[PDB]
Symmetry: C4
């Protein structure tokens, strides 16, 4: 029942001389889409303040991935893709399960063929309705790679992969601005979830994303060491120039809003308020302004290269197999 904070990685004898030797890119072949990936498998979350086109343009320079948020117009996507043809390779267009979500997704994918990834995202990936929607999307777009979540346990990972998803998004409640655990009491320790779900997915030649709960580069490295193919970040990418969220300067200091997608703040913006039978399951915070995201990416990547050197991993694909966790 482990969280990131409960472990450390044991160092091991290595032949690496310098952190600059470490290759942080991965190559994957996806189970169902049959497409191939090559890049640095860290993903900007599809939160409205994080999965922005400005984030994408910077993350592209480092070969990182963006799951674009679901609140841009087709026109905005077309403007982005026209101005940034070389950044469409590691983007996913996102959708929930509504008719309207699906139709807007379609419009994007039809108009911008270079977008080859789909991020299907719900709070509760255990619903049969969600499973059925994944099948539906696989059938409509057989050659796109599908990321689907969220879940925390292997039976659901398997069902979702067998239903047509390529990459399962793992995590219920670990997120920095999530309040699901406080409102519902439901969840799973994130490191344990990653280990269980990685094993399940990899038994089927599928993949996973560790989604949420990382607050330092060491956490990112732990999720990878536990078998995550990709790691998705919200909070660590919030608060930058390139992030969304209002910039607030008060009492001589600068902040940016950062908020859960099921916070009252988000529901006020996009659902016309909070439905009577719902409770909010995210919160709002004000993040001290961090400046340009490039400096944060370099810190994260720098940390992970260090991790690899300490365990003797010359390439990110070696990190999990050379990871021995010490309980602390």
């Amino acid at each position: 029942s482990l969280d990131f904070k409960d472990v450390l990685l044991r160092p091991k004898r290595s032949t690496l001389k310098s952190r600059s030797e470490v290759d942080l890119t991965r190559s994957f072949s996806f189970r169902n889409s049959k497409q191939t990936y090559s890049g640095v498998p860290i993903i900007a979350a599809n939160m409205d303040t994080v999965g922005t086109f400005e984030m994408a343009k910077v993350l592209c320079k480092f070969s990182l991935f963006t799951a674009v948020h679901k609140h841009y117009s087709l026109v905005q996507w077309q403007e982005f893709a026209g101005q940034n043809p070389d950044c469409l390779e590691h983007l996913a267009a996102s959708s929930g399960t509504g008719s309207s979500d699906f139709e807007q997704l379609e419009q994007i994918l039809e108009a911008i063929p270079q977008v080859k990834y789909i991020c299907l995202d719900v709070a509760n990936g255990y619903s049969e309705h969600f499973v059925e929607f994944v099948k539906d999307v696989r059938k409509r777009f057989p050659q796109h790679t599908i990321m689907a979540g969220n879940v925390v346990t292997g039976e659901m990972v398997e069902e979702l992969i067998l239903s047509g998803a390529d990459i399962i998004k793992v995590g219920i409640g670990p997120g920095s601005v999530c309040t699901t655990r406080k409102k519902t009491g439901v969840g799973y320790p994130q490191l344990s979830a990653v280990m269980e779900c990685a094993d399940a997915a990899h038994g089927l030649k599928g993949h996973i994303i560790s989604d949420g709960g990382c607050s330092c580069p060491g956490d990112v490295a732990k999720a990878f060491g536990a078998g995550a193919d990709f790691v998705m970040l919200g909070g660590m990418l919030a608060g930058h120039s390139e992030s969304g969220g209002e910039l607030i300067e008060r009492d001589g200091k600068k902040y940016k809003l950062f908020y859960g997608m099921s916070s009252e703040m988000a529901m006020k913006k996009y659902a016309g308020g909070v439905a009577e039978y719902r409770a909010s399951e995210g919160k709002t915070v004000e993040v001290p302004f961090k400046g340009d995201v490039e400096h944060t990416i370099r810190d994260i990547l720098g940390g992970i290269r260090s991790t690899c050197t300490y365990v003797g991993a010359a390439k990110l694909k070696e990190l999990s197999r050379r990871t021995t966790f010490i309980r602390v």
Copy 2:
């Protein structure tokens, strides 16, 4: 030795599509009164700041229950009942073991025949005196549903049910303004208390209330998942317009008093003071003003519907069967 903070509920595969589909009402048939209940089994605690007639009026609209405090006059009761006849089915009148308390209860029940629940409430329900009192109240009021507590272990749950109580109130020391544990060292972790006492009660076709220790909706869901038939709330319901407690406006902010029923504040108010051989076993806090309780009810119920969807429960009665706790 589990508390609510030590666990999460595991999600499970679900045919539920929306949280709006979840029915939170239960029906119970009581062992000794032979009466039947229908409602949302969340009870406002019989504290003078929580179990108020203003609270009852609002909770009634949501089919929630109020254990009315023991400090209203007979005419206040008569006035309430006259003005709010449809509220009377979801209320209990309360008493401790004092001859004065019981006599005032008898006058209320004589005046208000519509009150069909009795809440017999002492700090130490392990006393043979309390056991005997319960037997006497059963003999006196054969058709009234009797809630009796408090205890934390099965042997006492069984004895209390066999002596004539329908519903056993579980918890010693977990309350937000309780200081019993600090003053006496006595108590029992609440989640374990609920698990153990639920098994003991259910084996005899009786019922329990998890009383105390919930500070968010997820805790309430954990209590129900652990087998509690009802959950009683003090602090979560304190600090509202409908709550008791002085409203205090100071340093630009508003607060409401909230205090334990064995605090010095309560004893000064209703015993004249603290008797020489006694210690206070409650504290006072100032709760930032919360506004109208309807918003808090909606949040709590919304959290629990979300729990139910995550574990596949279409009805609250299915929650405990569908609950697998993960240790955190």
Copy 3:
């Protein structure tokens, strides 16, 4: 490896009706002095700010015990004894191992025959030198009851009782103003120390004092439940009118100094400062002023009566038999 915080007492079926029914006095017959005791076995520590004459005078009225500090003159003792002839029964005169300490102790005992207890107190009761001192004091005063400490393990409890001590003082490092653990790393969790040492002592028909680490009446109740015959209190008794320590009014609030007997404050007062080879093993704090100690005594005794009613103990003597600890 239990500290007080690690456990709660399980409640049990009781025939107690009222906390007023509980007798907190104990009767002891001491192994080596052959003297008898009757009183409430809580002791004000022999710290210079706690074991004062003003403290004794109040504690006396409750039948509590005072280990008088070792920094009164003989004239001071005679004055107290002359003015308070009925408060001499539950007093001890204190000494360390030095010849000047012994000479002063001897003057007190000779001049004040009503003083029938001796408190032999060193930081490190494991020294053969302390053992031999205990033996010598036993030989010199065969009808005086000897408290001796401090130690935390059974073997040493036994040695000290067999060397002539009646009551063994248990605790190394738990005290509120102690820094031994930070400075040395030496200690033993106090609840486990009490359980182990009480068994060792009782097997020889001797007694122990749980010395240090209580910060609420619940802790005192836990110590007694774990088998301690007496409980000694420093911090809980510091900061009262009757306490020593300078009264400091600053920034409109009142405080009283409270410091370790191994602190730099103490060694400056009574040694020539700190010897080059020693480190201080106590600290200084300013305790917000508590007023009269009577109120604190009532809070402590009331808490312990409540513990006894909860576990079915009519007498403090029964509390440890009736104690079942639950680990939290």
Copy 4:
């Protein structure tokens, strides 16, 4: 998986009557250099703010050891050595693995023959490159005692001794101004590291230094109790008159900078800044000014003498043997 905070020492019967009776010196014979040591085996860390010449001069008086930082020039070393001929016996010159570092060290050792210890110090002692370096250094200076680290596990302790190191420096991430754990997730709880590495070292009649994570005298005592031959201190020695770090008087209070050697502050000073592929693995703090280090040394040593009296150790040599740890919540 223990840290210092997870344990206490159990007192035991003794015949000691005063803390002043306790002998805190140790004598060691080193496996590979064959040289001998007599002193109090607490070492000032080779951080630029701790392993200074001012520090060394004071620690000398108490028979404590200094691993000098690697950022003094030859001329500064010669000045020190000419004014303090007797303080040279418990000094180590430090180096990392680069050719420039090796050359600086080689000049110091050639110019000042009285310096008989070498501290080879990298963040990652698990590197084959580091092992080959230790071997090269043992080849070049066969009679110098070599401290080499850092590592946290016994296999690497063994390999480094077999490769020619005498004393292995143990600790990855426990340090007060280290952020390696937050940046990489890598580490090992320090008390357990010490117990494992001390067994591995001692099997081969080598020695270890517990490096990092001590924040009170008790932690020092615990490290010795777990079998560390030496204990190295950064934070506990920062903030003094003798420490490096700028003295900053602000808001009516005095502070001294103390920072990790992998911090942005250090890399700005000694490298070009931070290379694009590196992350900072240390932080900067401002430590309230502590005054003269002598007073801190006396507090540390008095603490450890007290531990020894409580467990019956008349000499520091006895402490580990007489140590029984109790696990604490």
